[PDB]
Design an enzyme around this catalytic site. Structure first.
Site: not given
Ligand SMILES: *[B]([O])([O])[C]([C][C]([C])[C])[N]C(=O)[C]([C]C1=[C][C]=[C][C]=[C]1)[N]C(=O)C1=[C]N=[C][C]=N1
Ligand SMILES: [Mg+2]
Ligand SMILES: [Mg+2]
Ligand SMILES: [Mg+2]
Lengths: 244, 240, 222, 235, 231, 212, 233, 195, 204
Positions: F1, F49
């Site tokens: 993200t 999250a």
């Molecule tokens: B981002 O990469 O931090 C993102 C923000 C979120 C609000 C969509 N997080 C994610 O994609 C997380 C995994 C992650 C990756 C890298 C750092 C921290 C977290 N995934 C999820 O929240 C997720 C995954 N599958 C379904 C629903 N949510």
């Protein structure tokens, strides 16, 4: 159910008075007179024991004057049993404050706390109020020597000189007459006793019918001493002032 | 716990316990509030039946809820302390969460809400207290003056009085207070407040307390001599 | 130690059409390397023209669907038989899921239906309640096999128009219900070939303004 | 003494019936529902000229699509409003949509009979809950302390209620415009009010689908009062 | 007299006046009729309005797909009791995958109302209910009184002037019980029954409220122009 | 993200990416990481999250309740603190979120508050949160000035996300832009990174490392 | 959270044209110790349902009392307790399924795998599974523990899908079950020779067979097996 | 690893506190004021676990401000420090303790003396001439041991404080982005804007 | 990690002829870091003296607690608490926190005002009373103090001789402990006079 037998202690009269507070004050008016007089260099607490007996052990007796801490003391007028409940609570509050802030509790703060507790019984809980009026004699480094009174209503006020219990109307007139602002402890002692001597319902005022105490800066250098007078010491001060 | 319904309706649609709480307010010492153009003044009666009092330590009638809001009252003294304490806590609680001090309206609304809660809660009687809450909202120079009463209703006032003989001083204020042009200065506002109390008080000695509140947390209580100068000036003009 | 969660396998797929929506899911239920059932319905009609499936741990999945069906029922009682819109249903499900944030429903929830404009709608959830409206979503065990194929064949990703060489994209032309079902069937046939937890049968629920219709197709039983 | 939740020999709850008497003493509030909107109007009734009348808040916003007017012990209404506002917002949180005016009213009326020996007595205030939703359109409800709510086309509550209701009986028809309704509220308020009606001692408000719930300015109401006087003098 | 201050007090003749005063609230309430055949069960309710500007108070509440009731008396009390029924019907479904028996639904209402008549502080329910339903043992009609007494009947009526409709049903008993596989004729009999309790006023389009449940008929309410057919 | 938000002359720019991942698996490329809290307040999401969907939607309910009660728009400071005080109660309970509560009021002006699952609440001019925050910071710091046009500021935010979307494996999909004035936030397009990259490369003369 | 102590092994079952068959051996094992040889693990409820339970025996006995108490409760104020409002297999199952899932949700499971076999009011076959996790599923054949791995394959050769159920007679189905029980005795180290078998038929009702034994076993070929490879003697 | 420093001189108390806020890999802010004014003549700086620090400082602040209004009186630094210690001493045996270390610099208007109190998260109070929390003391105390006098002026205290910050900037691995210095004296609390 | 040796410090008490002596170091540290050389560990309530080693926050807390309790004792009893009675109060107070104890090593010392008898007592962190005739030791250098006291001590020492013994027992024990030192205080207690002496010792 139980509603039938409920006296409803915490309600207003049509005139806007609290029945139980008013009647508690009526109870206190029959209690032994207690007087407090504040001077520039100290405070006096004088109180009359109620129709004592010759067989009452006076030197180990305490019905009027109680110690809350080293700086604050109280004179009681009303039910002694009720007063002791509040006194122990007050003693604890002073210690709680000391533990928290590492400083002796200011007089007003202690008075407000006790007065707030009395107030609680007039507004909620359905219990009878405490049939007690206090005179608070105390000292702290903010306001110096302070005299307060609280009554069953939970209302408290500050005083230069004040009486509670019996014949307060007569007593307050005599104090109002002879009291002056530049007065000293030795003079206040004399005034306190003279007032009781004239307002008493007894034939004569004697040592066995009195409790007496002084809060003086008359202690070695900048500090305060509480003196709860012994029977022999009350007898001596009665002779000194010329009452017996 | 004690659950008894003390505040209840009567056949004629009245809650007597709330109405009897107003009678307690009627008995209380007179309190007056007057707002000028850039200030609010809170006048308070001190009954002179009690002499040999220690005015240093005796609870003052006007109480600071925060550095910018004050609260005076008429009615049961003991009851007022409970409202004041709650109000002072809520003032600090509001600063803590909203990061901004309470508005005078908000603080009034809270106190009024507490008072109302005690008119339909089990095992409790209503507060025998009406309050005058005055001050200035944060970063605002418009004066605020509100009144509350045992029932829990509250409202804003250009000028208002509560307590014993409040009918008389309200009569005075209604003819002497002009809305189009309120007391422009502090002097004019205090003078009008003292004048209104002199209709009821008896003697103008230690029986009148005056507290002037100005914008930006500028609150001061007038001394005996300062008030006595107003009393002298009013009567000297009256002798004509 | 007692492990309160389990994996019942399976795979689900929701595709939103122009005036319709499909929610497909295989009928195989498993633990580890054993088959529990070759036909255990996973996609449910929940009323108000909404279809739902909570894939993953079947006990939590069955619990969630049961509770949503219940929520639909009480929505009718409390709000004068009002029809629960798909967007409202989605938000309601978020609160059901997040209500167990610190002991989650271990499921991947998908609902399908029509929005208030009559257009096709698919919503997708994670186990802890986060949701998002989507045109296309596969969930469950073989989701990683199906989604890339759908990006390519539904949204026409990485596809361009011949002659232009990367300059002009393939236009996003709408798909019919017959065209979607073909993609659904091929997705599950392909998923069955390469995922051991996918097979036995494919049950599709199609949602149109006329109502909810069902279609069933055999899958390989190995 | 006697129970709070006691029935009379006639089959009515004493305390509920006594609370209705308190509402009769309260200031007048009128509501009129039309196909162009719902109008809410109240008598402020300041107890003294020194009371700043603009602080008298007897018309209140519950949500953007729901408004509320009160009559009786108005202090009792505050917790009812707080509940109504919470109910409206909470439903929007759970269902991503506006809440039905009837469902909101029902939620408020559930509190009404939660009294015994819960709160110690019924509410001493009646509410006119006006709003709009997609299903049933523009609606006006009368919420009592009995727990009962009736929907109305037009309703008056307070001290001049029966006199005003009789006037609403004749004047209301299903083809009223919003402007006509506004004037009709002002007309009937002026009729039942003790003091002379003006922009300071009377307040108007409305709820439309487009603009939502709006409390009218004193400048806007003053013009509608002036418009009323002229049209009454016209015949 | 001296024994009507609360529900916990028997009179010298063994009467519970607070319960009887709650029973009185039903008689003040608007009339409602219940009747059934072997296949269907019907509720017919005369709705009451405050005045001409007001709406007509709803009298019928749905509890499940196979059960519901009509009320007469304090409407909020009916809302409390109907809500309880809804939860009990729902508990039966969620836990036992079983539609709640109408007889057992009556037993649950009886016990809920009873607790209010024996305890201090509370009060009896001020409403009478007519519960209809179709379960595994066919169609059913119950009459709930807030004393706690629940009674399974072929037909009945409660509310003001309900004696007229109740007498009519007592005559028509043999006829309407035989109306099997015909919902419209069973409703007709119910509408004709409630007509015996009318004075001055007659059945209009927004005045009448009808509900029906049966063999292949979920509990459904008819109001407005849907009941114009039966006027 | 990757999510950023910065104060400037024209108010506040907010730019976020669109990717969500479960391990190495790309779950979604279409995620709205800006909760439109109400018409005047924006909130961002980052950190494994979506806890923040629930809680910032909830925040919007609290902000709505505030202005119903107080007849006044809630401050950015008050709104952010409702959220920070809430997550502080849940401190220790789960995973790692990070947000920027953005808004413009009369008393405050344009304001950004970094709220954090550890309870941290910081006011500031520039913030970048997420796994690709460092990449975004690089572009932002070197090109940031207070005296930026709304057009240029929007581009800088778009370009900063693109920089992170490129390098950070867990950032990408598309860029969602927002511009915030006190009259309200204004949405400025969803920008696919697949198309935006080649567009920016060609026009800007950047990304010479990559072959195109 | 606990661990199972005294345990019951496989419960096997299948549907046939007019009803269902269910079976389970009479052993209560204490780890590797075959402690209790007279344990009945098929518990009938009414004349139309049989609940077969595997796993922890103490928890089985608890479930047994819940079912016993369920029948008692159903009879209360129920004139049709032996007729229209009698307990159904579907009712009994859903109850257990509710309990099993509630208990797993309090992290204190009834450590069991349960199979509720029965026939409904309308004559439909009921056969559904539930376990300590609250997981539920239905199939033409259901089995627990080792039965899942060894019995199902054999029972599925008889009824492979829904359409094979009307083609399967009670004689063919019972034979398949009895053969499966023999196979489990050959190959399950925590099984016994003695078992119970129950048939719930929509026509002939509930037939409960106790004290059955695995018979017609093949062991003779063991004599020819010598050593582990190279040994001849 | 935040650095918070305190030095009590003749007629004032000086509190230096770092400006950096680091959330793992990045320095999110370089102008953070790690202090709260509890009362007109009492200032508390703080350092510990993120969130906990501000939450605690503001909670204390609110309580002292509540006391000030109630009694119309400012508590002594000693009294405030004792209150704060009790809160931390209460906190350490809680479900989730406040992980916060503080310095309380105040000027006692009654005794006309500056007072510096150092209290760690366990509730360990000590009155000192100069104090620090974390690794800050390890570098600075050797300089303060050498140069400190009880009769130093405020300007001399600031110079000695500069010498401490310079040594920290030389030998500490973490870039703390300089310090915000605040002086607490008879006239109240003011900030040294140039440092 | 180990709460009883984070802050460090020691207390020692001895009996003499018609007198008792109690002594402590002045160090308060954060493990290796020395924080304060004025952290006195000996407190007194009337004529009853209490030394407390261990976790400093609890040292402070308990002092404040026993001040609290001895003050209420005095108001009600109308007399000062005695060493024997106080010892029981300390034990009670400590044991009520049995499964969440104050990490301390208290040491009571004083002379009974009525009988004139010298009294000392030590405790573990949960309230067990060690009422020794000769001496009590406590703190991070308790082993060292045991060694010094066991060799240096003899019964019936005069106040001014006892001072030398306890002073040398503390000083030489503290110098063999990293977490103790940085100054020391010795209380010589007689029936109606108490002398307090600060010792000059190595400051490392
Ligand atoms: B981002 O990469 O931090 C993102 C923000 C979120 C609000 C969509 N997080 C994610 O994609 C997380 C995994 C992650 C990756 C890298 C750092 C921290 C977290 N995934 C999820 O929240 C997720 C995954 N599958 C379904 C629903 N949510
Ligand atoms: Mg296979
Ligand atoms: Mg990338
Ligand atoms: Mg420390």
């Amino acid at each position: 159910g139980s509603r039938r037998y409920d006296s409803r202690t915490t309600i207003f009269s049509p005139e806007g008075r609290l029945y139980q507070v008013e009647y508690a004050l009526e109870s206190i008016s029959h209690a032994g007179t207690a007087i407090g007089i504040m001077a520039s260099d100290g405070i006096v607490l004088a109180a009359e024991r109620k129709v004592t007996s010759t067989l009452l052990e006076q030197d180990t007796s305490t019905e009027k004057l109680y110690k809350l801490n080293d700086k604050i003391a109280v004179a009681v007028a009303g039910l002694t049993a009720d007063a002791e409940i509040l006194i122990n609570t007050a003693r604890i509050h002073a210690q709680n404050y000391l533990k928290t802030y590492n400083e002796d509790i200011p007089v007003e703060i202690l008075v407000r706390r006790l007065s707030d507790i009395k107030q609680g019984y007039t507004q909620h809980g359905g219990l009878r109020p405490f049939g007690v009026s206090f005179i608070y004699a105390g000292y702290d480094d903010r306001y110096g020597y302070q005299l307060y009174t609280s009554n069953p209503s939970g209302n408290y006020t500050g005083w230069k000189a004040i009486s509670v219990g019996a014949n307060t109307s007569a007593a307050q007139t005599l104090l109002q007459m002879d009291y002056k602002d530049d007065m000293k402890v030795d003079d206040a002692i004399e005034l306190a006793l003279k007032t009781l001597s004239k307002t008493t319902d007894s034939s004569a005022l004697t040592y066995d019918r009195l409790e007496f105490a002084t809060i003086r800066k008359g202690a070695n250098d900048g500090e305060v001493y509480q003196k709860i007078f012994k029977p022999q010491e009350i007898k001596d001060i009665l002779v000194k002032t010329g009452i017996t | 716990g004690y659950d008894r319904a003390l505040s209840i309706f009567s056949p004629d649609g009245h809650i007597f316990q709330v109405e009897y709480a107003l009678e307690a307010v009627k008995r209380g010492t007179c309190a007056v509030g007057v707002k000028g153009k850039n200030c609010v003044v809170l006048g308070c009666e001190r009954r002179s039946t009690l002499k040999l009092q220690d005015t240093r330590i005796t609870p003052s009638k006007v109480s600071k809820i925060d550095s910018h809001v004050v609260l005076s009252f008429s009615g049961l003294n003991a009851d007022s302390r409970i409202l004041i304490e709650k109000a002072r806590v809520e003032a600090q609680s509001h600063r803590l969460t909203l990061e901004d001090p309470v508005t005078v309206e908000y603080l009034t609304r809270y106190v009024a809400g507490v008072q109302q809660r005690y008119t339909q809660s089990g095992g409790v009687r209503p507060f025998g207290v009406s309050t005058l809450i005055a001050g200035f909202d944060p970063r605002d120079d418009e004066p605020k003056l509100y009144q509350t009463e045992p029932s829990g209703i509250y409202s804003s006032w250009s000028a208002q009085t509560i307590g014993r003989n409040s009918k008389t001083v309200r009569e005075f204020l209604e003819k002497n207070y002009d809305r189009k042009e309120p007391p422009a200065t502090v002097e004019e506002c205090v003078k009008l407040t003292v004048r209104s109390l002199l209709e009821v008080v008896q003697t103008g000695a230690k029986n009148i307390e005056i507290t002037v509140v100005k914008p930006d947390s500028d609150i001061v209580a007038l001394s005996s001599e300062e008030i006595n100068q107003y009393v002298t000036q009013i009567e000297q003009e009256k002798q004509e | 130690q007692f492990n309160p969660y389990g994996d019942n396998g399976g795979t689900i797929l929701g595709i939103a059409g122009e005036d319709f929506a499909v929610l497909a899911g295989d009928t195989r239920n498993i633990t580890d390397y054993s088959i529990n059932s070759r036909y255990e319905p996973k996609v449910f009609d929940c009323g108000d023209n909404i279809v739902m499936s909570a894939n993953g741990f079947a006990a939590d999945g069955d619990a969630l669907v049961k509770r949503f069906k219940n929520s639909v029922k009480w929505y009718h009682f409390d709000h004068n038989d009002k029809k629960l819109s798909i967007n409202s249903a989605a938000r309601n499900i978020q609160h059901l899921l997040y209500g167990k944030r610190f002991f989650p429903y271990y499921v991947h929830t998908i609902i399908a239906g029509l929005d208030e404009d009559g257009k096709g709608a698919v919503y997708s959830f994670d186990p802890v309640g986060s949701y998002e409206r989507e045109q296309c979503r596969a969930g469950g065990a073989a989701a990683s096999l199906i989604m890339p194929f759908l990006d390519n064949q539904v949204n026409f990703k990485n596809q361009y128009e011949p002659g232009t060489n990367g300059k002009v994209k393939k236009p996003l032309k709408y798909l019919s219900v017959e065209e979607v079902i073909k993609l659904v069937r091929d997705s599950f046939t392909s998923a069955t070939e390469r995922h051991i937890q996918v097979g036995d049968g494919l049950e599709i629920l199609i949602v149109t303004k006329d109502g909810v219709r069902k279609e069933f197709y055999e899958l390989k039983r190995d | 003494d006697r129970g709070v939740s006691t029935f009379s020999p006639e089959g009515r709850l004493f305390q509920v019936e006594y609370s209705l008497e308190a509402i009769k003493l309260g200031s007048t509030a009128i509501g009129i529902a039309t196909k162009e909107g719902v109008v809410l109007g109240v008598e402020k009734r300041a107890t003294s000229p020194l009371l700043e009348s603009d602080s008298i808040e007897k018309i209140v916003e519950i949500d953007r699509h729901i408004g509320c007017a009160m009559s009786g012990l108005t202090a009792d209404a505050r917790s009812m409003i707080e509940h109504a506002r919470t109910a409206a917002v909470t439903h929007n949180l759970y269902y991503d949509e506006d809440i039905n005016v009837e469902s909101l009213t029902q939620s408020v009326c559930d509190l009404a009979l939660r009294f015994g020996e819960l709160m110690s007595r019924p509410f001493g205030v009646a509410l006119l809950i006006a709003g709009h939703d997609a299903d049933d359109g523009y609606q006006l409800f009368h919420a009592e302390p009995s727990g009962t709510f009736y929907r109305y086309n037009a309703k008056a509550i307070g001290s001049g209620s029966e006199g005003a209701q009789a006037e609403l009986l004749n004047e209301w028809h299903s083809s009223l415009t919003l402007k006509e309704a506004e004037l009709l509220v002002l007309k009937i308020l002026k009729q039942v009010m003790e003091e002379k009606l003006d922009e300071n001692n009377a307040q108007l408000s409305c709820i439309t689908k487009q603009d939502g719930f709006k409390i009218y300015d004193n400048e806007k109401t003053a013009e509608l009062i002036k418009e009323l006087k002229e049209k009454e003098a016209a015949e | 007299n001296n024994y009507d201050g609360d529900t916990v007090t028997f009179s010298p003749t063994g009467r519970l006046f607070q319960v009887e005063y709650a029973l009185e609230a039903i008689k003040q309430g608007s009339v409602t009729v219940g009747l059934r055949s072997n296949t269907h069960a019907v509720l017919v309710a005369l709705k009451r309005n405050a005045d001409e500007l007001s709406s007509y108070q709803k009298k019928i509440i749905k509890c499940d797909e196979h059960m519901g009731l009509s009320l007469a008396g304090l409407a909020p009390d009916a809302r409390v009791l109907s809500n309880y029924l809804r939860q009990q019907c729902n508990y039966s479904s969620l836990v036992f995958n079983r539609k709640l028996a109408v007889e057992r639904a009556g037993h649950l209402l009886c016990d809920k109302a009873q607790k209010n008549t024996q305890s201090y502080g509370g009060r009896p329910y001020g409403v009478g209910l007519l519960i209809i339903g179709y379960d595994k043992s066919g169609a059913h009609l119950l009459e709930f009184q807030p004393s706690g007494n629940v009674t399974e009947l072929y037909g009945t009526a409660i509310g003001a002037r309900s004696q007229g409709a109740k007498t009519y049903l007592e005559r028509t008993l043999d006829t309407f019980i035989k109306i099997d596989g015909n919902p419209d004729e069973l409703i007709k009999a119910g509408v004709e029954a409630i007509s015996q309790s009318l004075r001055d006023e007659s059945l209009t389009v927004d005045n009448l409220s009808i509900a029906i449940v049966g063999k292949d008929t979920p509990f459904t309410i008819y109001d407005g122009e849907a009941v114009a057919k039966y006027i | 993200t990757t999510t950023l938000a910065f104060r400037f002359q024209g108010g506040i720019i907010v730019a976020v990416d669109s990717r969500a991942t479960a391990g190495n698996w790309v779950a979604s490329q279409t995620v709205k990481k800006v909760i439109e809290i109400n018409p005047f307040l924006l909130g961002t999401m980052a950190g494994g999250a979506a806890d923040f969907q629930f809680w910032e939607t909830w925040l919007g309910s609290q902000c709505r309740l505030h202005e119903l009660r107080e007849k006044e728009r809630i401050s950015v400071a008050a709104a952010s603190k409702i959220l920070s005080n809430l997550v502080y109660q849940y401190k220790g309970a789960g995973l790692s979120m990070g947000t920027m509560i953005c808004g413009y009021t009369r008393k405050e002006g344009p304001t950004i508050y970094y709220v954090d699952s550890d309870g941290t609440r910081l006011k500031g001019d520039i913030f970048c949160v997420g796994s690709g925050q460092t990449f975004a910071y690089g572009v932002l710091d070197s090109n940031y000035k207070w005296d930026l046009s709304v057009e240029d500021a929007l581009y800088l935010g778009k370009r900063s996300i693109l920089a992170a979307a490129h390098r950070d494996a867990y950032s990408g999909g598309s860029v969602n832009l927002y511009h915030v004035t006190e009259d309200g936030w204004i949405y400025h397009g969803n920008h696919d990174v697949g198309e935006l990259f080649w567009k920016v490369k060609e026009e800007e003369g950047s990304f010479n490392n990559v072959i195109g | 959270t606990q661990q199972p102590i005294v345990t019951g092994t496989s419960v096997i079952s299948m549907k046939y044209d007019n009803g269902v068959i269910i079976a389970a051996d009479n052993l209560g094992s204490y780890g590797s110790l075959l402690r209790f040889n007279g344990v009945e693990r098929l518990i009938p409820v009414g004349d139309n349902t049989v609940v077969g339970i595997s796993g922890d025996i103490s928890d089985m006995q608890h479930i047994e009392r819940l079912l016993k108490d369920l029948v008692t409760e159903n009879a209360y104020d129920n004139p049709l307790a032996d007729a229209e409002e009698a307990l159904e297999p579907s009712y009994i199952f859903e109850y257990l399924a509710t309990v099993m899932y509630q208990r797993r949700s309090k992290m204190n499971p009834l450590w069991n795998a349960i199979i509720v076999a029965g026939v409904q009011s309308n004559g439909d076959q009921f056969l559904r599974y539930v376990n300590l996790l609250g997981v539920t599923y239905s199939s033409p054949t259901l089995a627990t523990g080792f039965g899942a791995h060894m019995a199902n394959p054999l029972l599925r050769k008889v009824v492979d899908r829904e359409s094979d159920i009307p083609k399967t007679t009670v004689q063919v189905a019972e034979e398949a079950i009895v053969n499966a029980m023999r196979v489990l005795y050959y190959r399950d180290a925590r099984s016994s020779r003695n078992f119970s078998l129950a048939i719930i038929d929509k026509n002939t009702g509930l037939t409960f067979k106790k004290n059955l034994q695995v018979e017609n076993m093949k062991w003779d070929f063991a004599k020819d097996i010598k050593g582990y490879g190279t040994q001849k003697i | 690893m935040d650095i918070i420093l305190g030095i009590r001189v003749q007629d004032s108390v000086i509190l230096a506190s770092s400006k950096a806020v680091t959330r793992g890999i990045s320095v999110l802010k370089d102008s953070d004021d790690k202090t709260r004014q509890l009362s007109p003549h009492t200032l508390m700086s703080f350092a510990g676990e993120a969130g906990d620090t501000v939450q605690f400082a503001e909670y204390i602040q609110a309580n002292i401000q509540l006391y000030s209004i109630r009694e119309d009186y400012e508590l002594s630094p000693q009294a405030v420090s004792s209150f704060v210690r009790q809160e931390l001493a209460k906190s350490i045996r809680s479900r989730r303790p406040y992980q916060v270390n503080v310095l309380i610099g105040g000027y006692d208007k009654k005794k006309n003396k500056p007072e510096l109190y150092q209290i760690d998260y366990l509730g360990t109070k000590v009155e000192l001439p100069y104090g620090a929390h974390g690794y800050s003391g390890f570098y600075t105390f050797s300089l303060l041991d050498h140069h400190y006098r009880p009769d130093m002026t405020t300007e001399e205290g600031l110079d000695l404080l500069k010498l401490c910050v310079q040594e920290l900037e030389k030998r500490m691995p973490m870039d703390f982005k300089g310090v915000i210095v605040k002086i607490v004296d008879k006239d109240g609390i003011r900030q040294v804007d140039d440092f | 990690s180990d709460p009883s040796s984070i802050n460090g410090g020691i207390v020692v008490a001895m009996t003499g002829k018609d007198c008792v002596a109690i002594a402590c170091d002045l160090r308060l540290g954060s493990q290796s870091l020395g924080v304060s050389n004025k952290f006195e560990k000996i407190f007194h309530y009337g004529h009853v003296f209490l030394g407390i080693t261990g976790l400093a926050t609890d040292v402070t807390t308990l002092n404040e607690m026993f001040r609290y309790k001895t003050n209420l004792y005095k108001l009600k009893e109308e007399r000062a608490i005695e060493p024997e009675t106080f010892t029981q109060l300390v034990s009670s107070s400590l044991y009520e926190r049995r499964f969440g104890p104050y990490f301390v090593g208290p040491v009571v010392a004083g002379i009974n005002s009525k009988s004139g008898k010298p009294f000392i007592a030590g405790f573990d962190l949960i309230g067990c009373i060690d009422e020794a005739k000769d001496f009590i030791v406590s703190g991070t250098a308790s082993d060292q103090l045991f060694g010094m006291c066991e060799s240096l001590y003899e019964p019936n020492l005069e106040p001014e001789d006892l001072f030398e013994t306890i002073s040398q027992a503390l000083l030489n024990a503290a110098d063999r402990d990293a977490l103790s030192g940085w100054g020391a205080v010795v209380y010589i207690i007689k029936k109606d006079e108490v002398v307090k002496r600060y010792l000059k010792m190595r400051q490392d």
